[PDB]
Amino acid sequence: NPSLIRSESWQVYEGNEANLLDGDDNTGVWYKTLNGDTSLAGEFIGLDLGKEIKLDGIRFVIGKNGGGSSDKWNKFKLEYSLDNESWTTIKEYDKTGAPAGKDVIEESFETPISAKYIRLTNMENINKWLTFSEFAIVS
Ligand SMILES: CC(=O)N[C@H]1[C@H](O[C@H]2[C@@H](O)[C@H](O)[C@@H](CO)O[C@H]2O)O[C@H](CO)[C@@H](O)[C@@H]1O
Numbered sequence: 353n354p355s356l357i358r359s360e361s362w363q364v365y366e367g368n369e370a371n372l373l374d375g376d377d378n379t380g381v382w383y384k385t386l387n388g389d390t391s392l393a394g395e396f397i398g399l400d401l402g403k404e405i406k407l408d409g410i411r412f413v414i415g416k417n418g419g420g421s422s423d424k425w426n427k428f429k430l431e432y433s434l435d436n437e438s439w440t441t442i443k444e445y446d447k448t449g450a451p452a453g454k455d456v457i458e459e460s461f462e463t464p465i466s467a468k469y470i471r472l473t474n475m476e477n478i479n480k481w482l483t484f485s486e487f488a489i490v491s
Protein backbone atom coordinates (compact mmCIF):
# COMPACT_ATOMS: atom_id res chain seq x y z
CA ASN A 353 0.00 0.00 0.00
CA PRO A 354 0.91 3.73 -0.26
CA SER A 355 3.38 4.98 2.38
CA LEU A 356 3.29 8.37 4.15
CA ILE A 357 5.69 11.16 3.12
CA ARG A 358 5.98 14.58 4.75
CA SER A 359 8.31 17.52 5.46
CA GLU A 360 11.21 16.06 7.44
CA SER A 361 11.43 19.02 9.86
CA TRP A 362 7.99 18.44 11.44
CA GLN A 363 7.84 16.80 14.89
CA VAL A 364 4.86 14.76 16.20
CA TYR A 365 3.24 16.56 19.15
CA GLU A 366 0.09 14.46 19.69
CA GLY A 367 -1.23 11.31 17.99
CA ASN A 368 0.71 9.04 15.62
CA GLU A 369 1.55 9.15 11.90
CA ALA A 370 0.00 5.73 11.35
CA ASN A 371 -3.32 7.39 12.36
CA LEU A 372 -3.21 9.02 8.87
CA LEU A 373 -3.60 5.69 7.04
CA ASP A 374 -6.00 3.79 9.36
CA GLY A 375 -9.22 4.74 7.48
CA ASP A 376 -10.72 6.57 10.49
CA ASP A 377 -11.46 10.32 10.11
CA ASN A 378 -11.56 10.72 13.90
CA THR A 379 -7.91 9.73 14.39
CA GLY A 380 -5.13 12.07 13.30
CA VAL A 381 -1.84 13.68 14.14
CA TRP A 382 -0.72 17.06 15.50
CA TYR A 383 2.68 18.10 14.05
CA LYS A 384 4.88 20.74 15.68
CA THR A 385 6.44 23.05 13.08
CA LEU A 386 9.87 24.70 13.47
CA ASN A 387 10.99 28.06 12.01
CA GLY A 388 9.28 29.81 14.92
CA ASP A 389 6.10 27.71 14.84
CA THR A 390 5.72 28.38 11.12
CA SER A 391 4.95 26.13 8.19
CA LEU A 392 6.72 27.64 5.17
CA ALA A 393 5.19 27.65 1.72
CA GLY A 394 6.54 24.47 0.07
CA GLU A 395 6.16 22.10 3.04
CA PHE A 396 4.04 19.01 2.37
CA ILE A 397 2.33 15.78 3.35
CA GLY A 398 1.29 13.00 0.99
CA LEU A 399 1.80 9.49 -0.33
CA ASP A 400 4.56 7.50 -2.03
CA LEU A 401 2.59 5.06 -4.18
CA GLY A 402 5.40 2.50 -4.87
CA LYS A 403 5.27 2.42 -8.68
CA GLU A 404 3.64 4.57 -11.39
CA ILE A 405 -0.05 3.76 -10.75
CA LYS A 406 -2.91 5.54 -12.51
CA LEU A 407 -5.19 7.37 -10.06
CA ASP A 408 -8.93 8.09 -10.32
CA GLY A 409 -9.08 10.28 -7.20
CA ILE A 410 -7.82 11.21 -3.76
CA ARG A 411 -9.43 11.71 -0.39
CA PHE A 412 -7.35 13.76 2.06
CA VAL A 413 -8.69 14.84 5.43
CA ILE A 414 -6.87 17.83 6.92
CA GLY A 415 -7.24 19.20 10.42
CA LYS A 416 -8.78 17.21 13.28
CA ASN A 417 -11.00 17.80 16.33
CA GLY A 418 -10.08 19.29 19.69
CA GLY A 419 -6.39 20.02 19.93
CA GLY A 420 -4.98 21.87 16.95
CA SER A 421 -8.31 21.89 15.10
CA SER A 422 -7.51 25.37 13.75
CA ASP A 423 -3.91 24.35 12.85
CA LYS A 424 -4.32 24.09 9.07
CA TRP A 425 -2.83 25.66 5.97
CA ASN A 426 -4.73 28.61 4.42
CA LYS A 427 -3.37 28.19 0.93
CA PHE A 428 -2.16 24.88 -0.50
CA LYS A 429 -1.97 22.76 -3.66
CA LEU A 430 -2.52 19.19 -4.73
CA GLU A 431 0.44 18.09 -6.87
CA TYR A 432 1.78 14.76 -8.21
CA SER A 433 5.16 13.46 -9.44
CA LEU A 434 7.00 10.59 -11.13
CA ASP A 435 10.45 11.13 -9.57
CA ASN A 436 9.90 13.00 -6.28
CA GLU A 437 11.78 15.97 -7.81
CA SER A 438 9.48 17.55 -10.44
CA TRP A 439 5.85 18.26 -9.61
CA THR A 440 2.63 19.01 -11.47
CA THR A 441 -0.12 21.03 -9.84
CA ILE A 442 -3.58 19.53 -10.20
CA LYS A 443 -5.43 22.18 -8.20
CA GLU A 444 -4.79 25.03 -5.77
CA TYR A 445 -6.89 25.93 -2.71
CA ASP A 446 -7.45 28.99 -0.60
CA LYS A 447 -9.43 28.29 2.59
CA THR A 448 -8.25 31.28 4.61
CA GLY A 449 -10.50 31.97 7.59
CA ALA A 450 -12.58 28.78 7.09
CA PRO A 451 -13.86 27.08 10.27
CA ALA A 452 -11.51 25.08 12.48
CA GLY A 453 -11.96 21.28 12.37
CA LYS A 454 -11.71 18.38 9.93
CA ASP A 455 -11.94 19.18 6.21
CA VAL A 456 -12.28 16.47 3.61
CA ILE A 457 -10.40 17.33 0.41
CA GLU A 458 -11.93 14.83 -2.04
CA GLU A 459 -11.12 14.92 -5.75
CA SER A 460 -12.18 12.71 -8.65
CA PHE A 461 -10.03 12.83 -11.77
CA GLU A 462 -12.07 12.96 -14.99
CA THR A 463 -9.05 11.69 -16.92
CA PRO A 464 -7.02 9.28 -14.75
CA ILE A 465 -3.60 10.64 -13.73
CA SER A 466 -0.33 8.70 -13.91
CA ALA A 467 1.68 9.28 -10.69
CA LYS A 468 4.15 7.76 -8.21
CA TYR A 469 3.88 10.47 -5.52
CA ILE A 470 0.80 12.54 -4.72
CA ARG A 471 0.75 15.17 -1.96
CA LEU A 472 -0.68 18.39 -0.53
CA THR A 473 1.76 21.31 -0.39
CA ASN A 474 1.59 24.64 1.47
CA MET A 475 1.62 27.76 -0.74
CA GLU A 476 1.79 30.47 1.94
CA ASN A 477 3.73 30.84 5.17
CA ILE A 478 1.49 30.27 8.21
CA ASN A 479 2.42 30.86 11.87
CA LYS A 480 0.83 27.56 12.93
CA TRP A 481 1.52 23.94 13.79
CA LEU A 482 -0.47 21.42 11.66
CA THR A 483 -3.13 18.76 12.16
CA PHE A 484 -4.20 16.02 9.72
CA SER A 485 -6.44 12.95 9.92
CA GLU A 486 -6.34 10.78 6.77
CA PHE A 487 -4.80 10.29 3.29
CA ALA A 488 -6.17 7.89 0.68
CA ILE A 489 -6.23 7.28 -3.06
CA VAL A 490 -8.80 5.90 -5.47
CA SER A 491 -7.99 3.69 -8.47
C1 LIG B 1 -0.01 23.19 22.14
C2 LIG B 1 -0.20 24.53 21.50
O1 LIG B 1 -0.71 25.45 22.14
N1 LIG B 1 0.22 24.65 20.23
C3 LIG B 1 0.27 25.93 19.53
C4 LIG B 1 1.65 26.59 19.62
O2 LIG B 1 2.11 26.84 20.65
C5 LIG B 1 3.46 26.91 21.17
C6 LIG B 1 3.80 28.28 21.74
O3 LIG B 1 3.57 29.27 20.76
C7 LIG B 1 2.95 28.67 22.85
O4 LIG B 1 3.30 29.93 23.38
C8 LIG B 1 2.83 27.56 23.85
C9 LIG B 1 1.78 27.78 24.88
O5 LIG B 1 1.61 26.60 25.64
O6 LIG B 1 2.77 26.36 23.37
C10 LIG B 1 3.65 25.98 22.38
O7 LIG B 1 3.69 24.67 22.34
O8 LIG B 1 1.64 27.80 18.88
C11 LIG B 1 1.37 27.63 17.50
C12 LIG B 1 1.53 28.95 16.78
O9 LIG B 1 0.66 29.90 17.34
C13 LIG B 1 -0.03 27.04 17.29
O10 LIG B 1 -0.26 26.81 15.92
C14 LIG B 1 -0.15 25.74 18.08
O11 LIG B 1 -1.46 25.23 17.99
Ligand SMILES: [Ca+2]
Binds near residue numbers: 376377
Ligand atom coordinates in the same frame (compact mmCIF):
# COMPACT_ATOMS: atom_id res chain seq x y z
CA1 LIG C 1 -7.15 8.70 10.55
